[PDB]
PDB file of C-alpha atoms and ligand atoms in Angstrom:
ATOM      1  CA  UNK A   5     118.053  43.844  36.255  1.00 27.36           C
ATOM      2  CA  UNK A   6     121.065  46.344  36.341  1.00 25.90           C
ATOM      3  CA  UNK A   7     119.659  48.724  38.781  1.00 27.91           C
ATOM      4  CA  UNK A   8     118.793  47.620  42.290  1.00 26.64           C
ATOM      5  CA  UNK A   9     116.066  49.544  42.361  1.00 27.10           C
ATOM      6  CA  UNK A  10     114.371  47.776  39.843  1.00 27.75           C
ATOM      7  CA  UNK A  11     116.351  44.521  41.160  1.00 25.81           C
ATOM      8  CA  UNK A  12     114.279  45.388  44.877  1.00 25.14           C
ATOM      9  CA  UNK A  13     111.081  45.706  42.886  1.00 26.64           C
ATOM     10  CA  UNK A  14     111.145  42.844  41.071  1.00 26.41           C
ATOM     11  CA  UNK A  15     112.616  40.245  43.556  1.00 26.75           C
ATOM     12  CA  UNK A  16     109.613  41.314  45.689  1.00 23.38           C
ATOM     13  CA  UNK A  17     106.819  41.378  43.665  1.00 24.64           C
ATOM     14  CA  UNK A  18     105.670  37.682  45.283  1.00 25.46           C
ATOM     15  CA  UNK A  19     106.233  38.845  48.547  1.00 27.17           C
ATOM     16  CA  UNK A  20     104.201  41.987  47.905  1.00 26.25           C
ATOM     17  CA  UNK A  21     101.183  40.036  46.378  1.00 22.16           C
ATOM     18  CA  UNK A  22     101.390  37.834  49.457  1.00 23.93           C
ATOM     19  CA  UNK A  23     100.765  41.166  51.469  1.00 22.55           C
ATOM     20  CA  UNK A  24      98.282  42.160  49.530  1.00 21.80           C
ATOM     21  CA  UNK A  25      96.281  38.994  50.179  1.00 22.47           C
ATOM     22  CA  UNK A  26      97.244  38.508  54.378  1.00 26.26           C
ATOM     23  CA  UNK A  27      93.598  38.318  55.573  1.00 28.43           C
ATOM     24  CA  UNK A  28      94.226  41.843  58.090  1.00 26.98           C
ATOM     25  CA  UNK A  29      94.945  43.541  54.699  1.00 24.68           C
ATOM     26  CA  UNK A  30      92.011  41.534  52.975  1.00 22.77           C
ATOM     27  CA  UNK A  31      89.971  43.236  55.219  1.00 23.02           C
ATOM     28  CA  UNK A  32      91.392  47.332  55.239  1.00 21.50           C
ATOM     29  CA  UNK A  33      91.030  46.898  51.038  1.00 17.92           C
ATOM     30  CA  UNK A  34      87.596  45.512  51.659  1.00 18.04           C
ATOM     31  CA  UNK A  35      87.249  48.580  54.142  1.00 17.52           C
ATOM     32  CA  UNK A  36      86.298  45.898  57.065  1.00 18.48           C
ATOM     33  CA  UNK A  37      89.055  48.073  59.269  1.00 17.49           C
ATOM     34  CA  UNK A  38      87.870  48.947  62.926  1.00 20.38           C
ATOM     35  CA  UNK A  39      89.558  51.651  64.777  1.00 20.19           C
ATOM     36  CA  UNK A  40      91.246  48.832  67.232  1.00 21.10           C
ATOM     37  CA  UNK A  41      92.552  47.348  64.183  1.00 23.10           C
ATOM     38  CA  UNK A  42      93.596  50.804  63.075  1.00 24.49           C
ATOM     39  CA  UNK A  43      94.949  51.583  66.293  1.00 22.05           C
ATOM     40  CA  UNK A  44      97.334  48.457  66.576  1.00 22.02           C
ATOM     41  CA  UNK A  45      98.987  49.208  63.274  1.00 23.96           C
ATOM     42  CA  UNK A  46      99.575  52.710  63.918  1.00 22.58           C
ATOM     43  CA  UNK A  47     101.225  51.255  67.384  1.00 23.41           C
ATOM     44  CA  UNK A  48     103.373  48.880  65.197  1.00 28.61           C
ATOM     45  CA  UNK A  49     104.373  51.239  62.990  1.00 29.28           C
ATOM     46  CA  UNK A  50     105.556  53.439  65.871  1.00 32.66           C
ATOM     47  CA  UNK A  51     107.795  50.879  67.269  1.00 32.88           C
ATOM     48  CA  UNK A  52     109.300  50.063  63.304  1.00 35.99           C
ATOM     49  CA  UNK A  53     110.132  53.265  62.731  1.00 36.58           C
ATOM     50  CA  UNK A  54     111.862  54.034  66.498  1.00 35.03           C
ATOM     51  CA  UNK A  55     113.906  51.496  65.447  1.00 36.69           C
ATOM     52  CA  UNK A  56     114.936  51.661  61.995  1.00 39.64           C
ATOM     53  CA  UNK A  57     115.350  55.536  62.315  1.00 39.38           C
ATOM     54  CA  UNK A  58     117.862  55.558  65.604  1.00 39.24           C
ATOM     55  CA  UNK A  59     119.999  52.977  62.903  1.00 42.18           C
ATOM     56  CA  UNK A  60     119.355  55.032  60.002  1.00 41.92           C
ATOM     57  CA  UNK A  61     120.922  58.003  62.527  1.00 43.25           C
ATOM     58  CA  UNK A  62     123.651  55.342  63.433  1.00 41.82           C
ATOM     59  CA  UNK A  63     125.122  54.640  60.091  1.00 41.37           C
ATOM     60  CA  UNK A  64     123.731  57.779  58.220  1.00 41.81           C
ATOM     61  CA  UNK A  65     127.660  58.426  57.325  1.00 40.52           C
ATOM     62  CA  UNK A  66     128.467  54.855  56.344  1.00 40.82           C
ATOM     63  CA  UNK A  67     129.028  54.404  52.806  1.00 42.38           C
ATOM     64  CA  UNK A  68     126.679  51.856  52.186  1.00 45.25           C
ATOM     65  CA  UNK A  69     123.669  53.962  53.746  1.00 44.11           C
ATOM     66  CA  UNK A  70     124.738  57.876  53.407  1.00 42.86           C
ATOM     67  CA  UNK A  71     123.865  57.975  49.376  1.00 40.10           C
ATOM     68  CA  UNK A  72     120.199  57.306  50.957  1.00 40.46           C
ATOM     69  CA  UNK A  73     119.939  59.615  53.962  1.00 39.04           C
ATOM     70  CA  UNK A  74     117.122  61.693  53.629  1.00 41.09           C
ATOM     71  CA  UNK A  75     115.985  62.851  57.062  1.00 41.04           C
ATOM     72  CA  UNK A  76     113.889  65.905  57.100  1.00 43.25           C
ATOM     73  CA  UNK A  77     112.358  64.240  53.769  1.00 44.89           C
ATOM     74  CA  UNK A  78     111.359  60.198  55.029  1.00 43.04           C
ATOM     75  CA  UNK A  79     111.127  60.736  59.102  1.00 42.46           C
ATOM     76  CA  UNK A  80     107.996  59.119  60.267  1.00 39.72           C
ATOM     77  CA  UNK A  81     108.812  58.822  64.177  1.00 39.45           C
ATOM     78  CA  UNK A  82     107.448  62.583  65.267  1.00 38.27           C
ATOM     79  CA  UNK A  83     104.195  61.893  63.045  1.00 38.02           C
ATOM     80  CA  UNK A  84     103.448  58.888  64.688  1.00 38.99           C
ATOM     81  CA  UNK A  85     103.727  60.135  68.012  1.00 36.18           C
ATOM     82  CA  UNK A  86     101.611  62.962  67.235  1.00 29.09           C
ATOM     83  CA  UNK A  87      98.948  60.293  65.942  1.00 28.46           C
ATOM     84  CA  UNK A  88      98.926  57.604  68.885  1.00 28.59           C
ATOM     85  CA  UNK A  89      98.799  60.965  71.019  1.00 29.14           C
ATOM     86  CA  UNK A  90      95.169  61.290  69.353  1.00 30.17           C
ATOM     87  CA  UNK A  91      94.359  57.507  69.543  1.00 32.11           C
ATOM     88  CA  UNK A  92      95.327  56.198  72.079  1.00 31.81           C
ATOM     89  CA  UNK A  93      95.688  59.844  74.485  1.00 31.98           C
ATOM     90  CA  UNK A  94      97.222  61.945  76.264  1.00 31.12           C
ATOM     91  CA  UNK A  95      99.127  58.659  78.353  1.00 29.06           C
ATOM     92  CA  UNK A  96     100.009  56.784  75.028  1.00 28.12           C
ATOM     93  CA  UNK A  97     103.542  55.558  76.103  1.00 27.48           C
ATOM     94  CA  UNK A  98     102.245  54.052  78.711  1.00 25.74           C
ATOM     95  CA  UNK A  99      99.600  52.062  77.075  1.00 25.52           C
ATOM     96  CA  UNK A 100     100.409  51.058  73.755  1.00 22.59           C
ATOM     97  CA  UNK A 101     101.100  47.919  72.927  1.00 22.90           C
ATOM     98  CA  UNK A 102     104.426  45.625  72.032  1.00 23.38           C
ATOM     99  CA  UNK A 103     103.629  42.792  70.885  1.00 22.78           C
ATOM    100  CA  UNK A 104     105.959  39.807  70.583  1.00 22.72           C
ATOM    101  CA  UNK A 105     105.468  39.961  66.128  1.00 23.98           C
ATOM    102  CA  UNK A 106     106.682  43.977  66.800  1.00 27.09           C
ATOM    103  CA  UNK A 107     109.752  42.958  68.862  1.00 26.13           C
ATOM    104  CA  UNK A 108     110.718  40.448  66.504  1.00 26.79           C
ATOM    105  CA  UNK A 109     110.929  43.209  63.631  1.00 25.89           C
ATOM    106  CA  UNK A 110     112.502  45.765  65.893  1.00 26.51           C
ATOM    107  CA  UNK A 111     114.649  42.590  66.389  1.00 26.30           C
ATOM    108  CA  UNK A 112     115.719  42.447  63.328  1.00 25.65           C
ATOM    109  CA  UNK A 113     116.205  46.431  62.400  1.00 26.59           C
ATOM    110  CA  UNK A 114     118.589  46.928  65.418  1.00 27.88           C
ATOM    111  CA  UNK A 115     120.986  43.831  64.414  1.00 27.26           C
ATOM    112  CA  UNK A 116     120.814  44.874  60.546  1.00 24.19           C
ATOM    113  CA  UNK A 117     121.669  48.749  61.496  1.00 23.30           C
ATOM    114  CA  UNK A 118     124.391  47.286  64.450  1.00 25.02           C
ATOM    115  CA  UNK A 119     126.161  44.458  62.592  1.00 26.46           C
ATOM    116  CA  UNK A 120     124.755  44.216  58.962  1.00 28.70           C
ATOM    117  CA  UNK A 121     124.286  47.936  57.959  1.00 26.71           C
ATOM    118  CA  UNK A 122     125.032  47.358  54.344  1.00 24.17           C
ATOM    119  CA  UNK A 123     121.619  45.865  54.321  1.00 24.01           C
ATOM    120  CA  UNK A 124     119.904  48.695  55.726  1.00 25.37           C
ATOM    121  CA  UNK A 125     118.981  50.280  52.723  1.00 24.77           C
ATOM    122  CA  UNK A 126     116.892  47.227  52.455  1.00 28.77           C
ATOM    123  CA  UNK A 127     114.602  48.294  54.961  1.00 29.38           C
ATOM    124  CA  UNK A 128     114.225  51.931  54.600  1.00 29.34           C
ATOM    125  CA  UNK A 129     113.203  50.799  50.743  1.00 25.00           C
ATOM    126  CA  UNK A 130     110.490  48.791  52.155  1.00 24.45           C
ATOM    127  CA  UNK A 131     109.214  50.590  54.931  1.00 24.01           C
ATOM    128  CA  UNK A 132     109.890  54.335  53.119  1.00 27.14           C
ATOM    129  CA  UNK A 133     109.012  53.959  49.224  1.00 28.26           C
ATOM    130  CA  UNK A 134     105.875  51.666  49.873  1.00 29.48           C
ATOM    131  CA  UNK A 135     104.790  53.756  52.626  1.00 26.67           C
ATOM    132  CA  UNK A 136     105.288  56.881  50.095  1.00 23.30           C
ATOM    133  CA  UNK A 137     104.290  55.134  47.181  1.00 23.07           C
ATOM    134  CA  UNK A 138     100.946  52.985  48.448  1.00 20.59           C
ATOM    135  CA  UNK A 139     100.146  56.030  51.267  1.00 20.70           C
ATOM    136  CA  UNK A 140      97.411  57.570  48.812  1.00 24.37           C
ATOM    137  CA  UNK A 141      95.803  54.391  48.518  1.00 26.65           C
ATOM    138  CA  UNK A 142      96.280  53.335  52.160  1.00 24.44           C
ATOM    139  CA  UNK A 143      95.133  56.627  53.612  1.00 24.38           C
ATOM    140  CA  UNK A 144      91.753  56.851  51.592  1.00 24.33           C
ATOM    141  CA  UNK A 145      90.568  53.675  52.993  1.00 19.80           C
ATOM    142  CA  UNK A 146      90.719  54.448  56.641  1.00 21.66           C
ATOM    143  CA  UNK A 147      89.369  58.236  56.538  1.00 25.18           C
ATOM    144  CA  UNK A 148      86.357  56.541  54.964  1.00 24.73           C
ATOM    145  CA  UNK A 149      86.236  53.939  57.194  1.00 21.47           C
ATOM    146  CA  UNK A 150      87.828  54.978  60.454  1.00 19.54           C
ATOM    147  CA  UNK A 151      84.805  57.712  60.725  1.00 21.50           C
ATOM    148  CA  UNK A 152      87.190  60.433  62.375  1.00 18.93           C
ATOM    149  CA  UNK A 153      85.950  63.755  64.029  1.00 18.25           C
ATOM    150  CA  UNK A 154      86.736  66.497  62.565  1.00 16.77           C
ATOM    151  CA  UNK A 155      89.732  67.360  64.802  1.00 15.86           C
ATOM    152  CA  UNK A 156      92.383  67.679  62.573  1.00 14.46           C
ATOM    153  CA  UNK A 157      94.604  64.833  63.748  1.00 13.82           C
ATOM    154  CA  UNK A 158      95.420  60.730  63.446  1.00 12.59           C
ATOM    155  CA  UNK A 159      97.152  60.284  60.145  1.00 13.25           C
ATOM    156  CA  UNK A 160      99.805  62.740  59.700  1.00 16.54           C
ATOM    157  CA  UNK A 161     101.478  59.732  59.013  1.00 14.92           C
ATOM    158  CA  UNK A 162     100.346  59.964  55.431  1.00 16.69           C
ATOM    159  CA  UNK A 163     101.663  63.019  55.092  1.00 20.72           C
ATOM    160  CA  UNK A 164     105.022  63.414  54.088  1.00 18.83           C
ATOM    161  CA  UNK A 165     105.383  66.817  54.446  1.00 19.03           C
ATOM    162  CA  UNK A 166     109.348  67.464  53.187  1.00 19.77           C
ATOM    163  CA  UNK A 167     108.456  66.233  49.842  1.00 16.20           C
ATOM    164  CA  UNK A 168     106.620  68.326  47.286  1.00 16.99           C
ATOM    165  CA  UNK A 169     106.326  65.937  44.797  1.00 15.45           C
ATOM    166  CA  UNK A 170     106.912  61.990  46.176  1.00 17.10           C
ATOM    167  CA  UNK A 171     106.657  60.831  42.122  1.00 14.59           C
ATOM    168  CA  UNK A 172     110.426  63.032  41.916  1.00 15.08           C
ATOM    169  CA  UNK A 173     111.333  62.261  44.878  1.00 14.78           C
ATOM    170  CA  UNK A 174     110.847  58.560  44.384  1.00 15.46           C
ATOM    171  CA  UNK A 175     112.920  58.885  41.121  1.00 15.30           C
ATOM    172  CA  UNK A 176     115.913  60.362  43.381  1.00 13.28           C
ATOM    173  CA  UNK A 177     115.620  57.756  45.371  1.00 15.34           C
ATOM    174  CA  UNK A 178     115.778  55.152  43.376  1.00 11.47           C
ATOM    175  CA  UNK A 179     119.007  56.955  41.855  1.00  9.64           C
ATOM    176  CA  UNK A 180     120.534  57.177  44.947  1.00  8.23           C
ATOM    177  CA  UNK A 181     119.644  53.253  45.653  1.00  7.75           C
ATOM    178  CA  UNK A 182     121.308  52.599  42.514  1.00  5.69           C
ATOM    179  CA  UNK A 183     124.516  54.653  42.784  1.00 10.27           C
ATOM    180  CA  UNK A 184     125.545  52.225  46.016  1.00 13.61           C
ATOM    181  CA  UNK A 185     128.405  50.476  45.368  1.00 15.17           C
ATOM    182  CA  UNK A 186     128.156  46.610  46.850  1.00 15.71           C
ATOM    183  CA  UNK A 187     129.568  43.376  45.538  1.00 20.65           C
ATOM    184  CA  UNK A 188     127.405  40.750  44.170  1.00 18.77           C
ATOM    185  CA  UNK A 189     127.477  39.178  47.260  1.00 16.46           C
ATOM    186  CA  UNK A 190     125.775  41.736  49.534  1.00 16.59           C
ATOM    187  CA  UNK A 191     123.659  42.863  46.343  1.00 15.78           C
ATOM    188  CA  UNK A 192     121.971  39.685  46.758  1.00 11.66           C
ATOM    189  CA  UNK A 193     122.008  39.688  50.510  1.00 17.25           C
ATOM    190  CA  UNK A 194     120.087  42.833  50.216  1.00 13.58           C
ATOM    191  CA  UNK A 195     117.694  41.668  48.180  1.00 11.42           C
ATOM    192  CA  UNK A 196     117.019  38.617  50.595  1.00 12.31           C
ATOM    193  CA  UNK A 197     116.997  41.135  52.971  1.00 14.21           C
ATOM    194  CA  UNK A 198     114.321  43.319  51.218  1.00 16.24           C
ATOM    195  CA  UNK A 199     112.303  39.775  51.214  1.00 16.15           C
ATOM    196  CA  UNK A 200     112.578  39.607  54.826  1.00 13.85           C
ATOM    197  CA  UNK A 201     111.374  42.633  55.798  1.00 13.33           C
ATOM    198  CA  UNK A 202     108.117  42.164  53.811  1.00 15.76           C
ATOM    199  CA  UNK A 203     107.961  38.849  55.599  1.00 18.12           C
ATOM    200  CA  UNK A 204     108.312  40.187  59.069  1.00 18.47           C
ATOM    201  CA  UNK A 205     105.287  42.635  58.223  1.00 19.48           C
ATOM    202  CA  UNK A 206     103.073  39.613  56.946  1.00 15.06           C
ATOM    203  CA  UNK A 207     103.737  37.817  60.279  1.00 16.15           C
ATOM    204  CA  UNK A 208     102.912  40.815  62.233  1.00 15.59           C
ATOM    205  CA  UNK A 209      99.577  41.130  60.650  1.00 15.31           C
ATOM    206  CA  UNK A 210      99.048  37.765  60.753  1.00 13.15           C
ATOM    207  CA  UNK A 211      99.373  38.247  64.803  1.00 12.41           C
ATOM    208  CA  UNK A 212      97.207  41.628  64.819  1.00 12.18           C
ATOM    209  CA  UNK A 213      94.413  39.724  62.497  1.00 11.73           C
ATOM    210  CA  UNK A 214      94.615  37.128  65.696  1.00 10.12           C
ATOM    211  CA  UNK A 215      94.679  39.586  68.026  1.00 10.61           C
ATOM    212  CA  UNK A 216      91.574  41.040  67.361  1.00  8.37           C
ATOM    213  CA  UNK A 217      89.061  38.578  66.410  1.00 10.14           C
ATOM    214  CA  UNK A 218      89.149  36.759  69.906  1.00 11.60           C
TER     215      UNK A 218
HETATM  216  C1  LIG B  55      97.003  45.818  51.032  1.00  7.96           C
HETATM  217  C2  LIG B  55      98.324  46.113  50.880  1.00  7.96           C
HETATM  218  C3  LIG B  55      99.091  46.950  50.090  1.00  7.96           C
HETATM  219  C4  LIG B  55      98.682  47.726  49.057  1.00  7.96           C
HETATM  220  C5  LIG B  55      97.244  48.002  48.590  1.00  7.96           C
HETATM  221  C6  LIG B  55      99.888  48.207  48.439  1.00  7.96           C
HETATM  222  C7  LIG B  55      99.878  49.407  47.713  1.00  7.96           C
HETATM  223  C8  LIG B  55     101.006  49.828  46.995  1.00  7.96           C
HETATM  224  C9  LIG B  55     100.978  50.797  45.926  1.00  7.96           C
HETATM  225  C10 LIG B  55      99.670  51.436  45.437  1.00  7.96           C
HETATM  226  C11 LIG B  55     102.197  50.762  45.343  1.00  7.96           C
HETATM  227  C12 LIG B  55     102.544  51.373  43.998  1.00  7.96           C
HETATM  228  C13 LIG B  55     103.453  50.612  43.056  1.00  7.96           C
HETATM  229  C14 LIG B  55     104.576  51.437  42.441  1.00  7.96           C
HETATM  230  O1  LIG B  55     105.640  51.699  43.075  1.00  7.96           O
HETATM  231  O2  LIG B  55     104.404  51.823  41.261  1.00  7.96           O
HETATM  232  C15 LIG B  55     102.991  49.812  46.069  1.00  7.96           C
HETATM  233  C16 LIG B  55     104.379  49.962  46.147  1.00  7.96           C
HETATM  234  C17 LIG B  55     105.210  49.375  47.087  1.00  7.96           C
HETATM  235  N1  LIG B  55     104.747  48.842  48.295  1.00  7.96           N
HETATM  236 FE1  LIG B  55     102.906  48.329  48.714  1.00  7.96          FE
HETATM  237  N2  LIG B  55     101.030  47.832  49.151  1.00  7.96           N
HETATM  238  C18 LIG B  55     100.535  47.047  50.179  1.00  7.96           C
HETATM  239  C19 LIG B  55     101.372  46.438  51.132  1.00  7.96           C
HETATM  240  C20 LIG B  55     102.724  46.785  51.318  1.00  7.96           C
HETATM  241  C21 LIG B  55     103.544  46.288  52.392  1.00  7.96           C
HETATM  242  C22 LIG B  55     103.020  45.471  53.574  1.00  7.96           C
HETATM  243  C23 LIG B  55     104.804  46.684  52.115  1.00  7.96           C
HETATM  244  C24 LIG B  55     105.943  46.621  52.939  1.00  7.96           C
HETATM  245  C25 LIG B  55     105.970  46.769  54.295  1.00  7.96           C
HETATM  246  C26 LIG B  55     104.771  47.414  50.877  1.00  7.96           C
HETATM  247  C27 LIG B  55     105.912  47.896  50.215  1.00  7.96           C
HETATM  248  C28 LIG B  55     105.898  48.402  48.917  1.00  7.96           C
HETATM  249  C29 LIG B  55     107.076  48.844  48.205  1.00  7.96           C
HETATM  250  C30 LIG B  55     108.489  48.738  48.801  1.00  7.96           C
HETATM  251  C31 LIG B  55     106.650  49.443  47.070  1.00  7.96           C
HETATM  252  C32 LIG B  55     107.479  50.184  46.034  1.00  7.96           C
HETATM  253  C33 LIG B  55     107.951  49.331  44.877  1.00  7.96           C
HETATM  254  C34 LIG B  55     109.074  49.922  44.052  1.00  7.96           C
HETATM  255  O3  LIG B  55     108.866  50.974  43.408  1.00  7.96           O
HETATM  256  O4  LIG B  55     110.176  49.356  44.035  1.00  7.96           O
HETATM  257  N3  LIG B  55     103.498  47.409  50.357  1.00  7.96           N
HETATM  258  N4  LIG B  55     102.253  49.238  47.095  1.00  7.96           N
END
């Protein structure tokens, strides 16, 4: 299609679907999530975000990423740590865990935002507008099956708190997306990219799914 937002959407429907069906996920639709389970994606998705927001901050005035910075609207690293502070305590730094699939997608965010940052707008498209646009879905599951007190903490990361509406906000981003300039060349290294990042998420819950049925 014309616009690469709809270019993104489409080039990764496959790889979507093959989230959809990776067994970890299999099980959080099927509500079969435990709160270890729970607890190692929240870790992951502390260490993605670390990383792809210090390169977001990196190249925020580049032209082929400032069209897409929205800070105070997207930033997931300060709701994170106030989640892992509830699961995993008062000592979370210390104890959370980095697992070799993690490293390999902080890997790849810190040589994308250091020597490819034209391709960072693939990333922030996968991690930020699926985490927007499937949070509603994503959230209701664990609430209902995580079986949380009632202390008012553990998934502000569902929240995005900057954004009164994320169906408007979506649309500007997906304007934004589209009013980037790139050659064909890096259009379609983008979308590769885009590809990639779904990919690195698939293998990292293929290694959680391992990690917790021993
Ligand atoms: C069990 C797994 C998942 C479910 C149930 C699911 C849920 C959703 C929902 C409900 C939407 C709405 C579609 C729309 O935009 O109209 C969607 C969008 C999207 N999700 Fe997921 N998702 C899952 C896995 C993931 C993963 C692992 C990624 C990437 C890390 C991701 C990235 C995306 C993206 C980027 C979009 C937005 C598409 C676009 O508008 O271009 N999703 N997903």
């Amino acid at each position: 299609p014309q616009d690469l937002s709809e270019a993104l959407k489409e080039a990764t429907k496959e790889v979507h679907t093959q989230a959809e069906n990776a067994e970890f996920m299999r099980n959080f639709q099927k509500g079969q999530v435990t709160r270890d389970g729970f607890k190692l994606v929240m870790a992951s998705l502390y260490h993605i975000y670390v990383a792809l927001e210090e390169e977001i901050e990196r190249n925020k005035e580049s032209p082929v990423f400032a069209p897409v910075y929205f800070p105070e609207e997207l930033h997931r690293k300060a709701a994170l740590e106030q989640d892992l502070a509830f699961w995993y305590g008062p000592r979370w730094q210390e104890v959370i865990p980095y697992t070799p699939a993690m490293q390999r997608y902080v890997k790849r965010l810190h040589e994308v935002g250091r020597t490819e940052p034209e391709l960072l707008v693939a990333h922030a498209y996968t991690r930020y507008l699926g985490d927007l646009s499937g949070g509603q879905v994503l959230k209701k599951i664990a609430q209902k099956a995580l079986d949380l007190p009632s202390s008012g903490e553990g998934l502000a990361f569902f929240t995005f708190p900057n954004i009164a509406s994320a169906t408007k906000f979506k649309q500007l981003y997906r304007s934004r997306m589209n009013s980037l300039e790139m050659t064909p060349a890096v259009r379609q290294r983008v979308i590769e990219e885009a590809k990639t990042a779904f990919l690195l998420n698939i293998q990292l819950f293929e290694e959680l799914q391992e990690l917790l049925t021993h």
